[PDB]
Amino acid sequence: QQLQVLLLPKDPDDERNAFLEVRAGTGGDEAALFAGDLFRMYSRYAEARRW
RNA sequence: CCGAGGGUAGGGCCCGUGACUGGGGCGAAGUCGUAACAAGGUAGCUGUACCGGAAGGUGCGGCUGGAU
Ligand SMILES: [Mg+2]
Ligand SMILES: [Mg+2]
Ligand SMILES: [Mg+2]
Ligand SMILES: [Mg+2]
Ligand SMILES: [Mg+2]
Ligand SMILES: [Mg+2]
Ligand SMILES: [Mg+2]
Ligand SMILES: [Mg+2]
Ligand SMILES: [Mg+2]
Ligand SMILES: [Mg+2]
Ligand SMILES: [Mg+2]
Ligand SMILES: [Mg+2]
Ligand SMILES: [Mg+2]
């Protein structure tokens, strides 16, 4: 497998720490309920990589 | 003399436009309370007046399109 050289495009803020905010939308307290469901999911993902 | 029209001045109407402002219509979700529909938890509605974040409240009279 000839690994295609992916070392051509550079990136400034690619390794920097990131702010993440989740906001509820359409559907009243149901979307608010899901914004926690998205946040735990990103919490499981952050701790799974020692973040 | 009249006279197209030009000029000066002052009015009337209509249209476009204007910092800003007043409310109105619409919204798969927001905040605050819950005024009305049951006696809707203070029966409701009403003209008027005063008042209150807001639905609204209270006064004076009126109607029943008011339960028991
Ligand atoms: Mg003459
Ligand atoms: Mg003339
Ligand atoms: Mg003339
Ligand atoms: Mg406006
Ligand atoms: Mg009332
Ligand atoms: Mg009520
Ligand atoms: Mg009532
Ligand atoms: Mg009154
Ligand atoms: Mg006031
Ligand atoms: Mg106040
Ligand atoms: Mg009062
Ligand atoms: Mg009365
Ligand atoms: Mg009468």
From Swiss-Prot:
Methylated by PrmC. Methylation increases the termination efficiency of RF1. It is found in: Cytoplasm. Belongs to the prokaryotic/mitochondrial release factor family. Peptide chain release factor 1 directs the termination of translation in response to the peptide chain termination codons UAG and UAA. This is Peptide chain release factor 1. It comes from Escherichia coli O45:K1 (strain S88 / ExPEC). The lineage of its organism: Bacteria, Pseudomonadati, Pseudomonadota, Gammaproteobacteria, Enterobacterales. The chain holds residues 94 to 144 of 360 of the full protein.
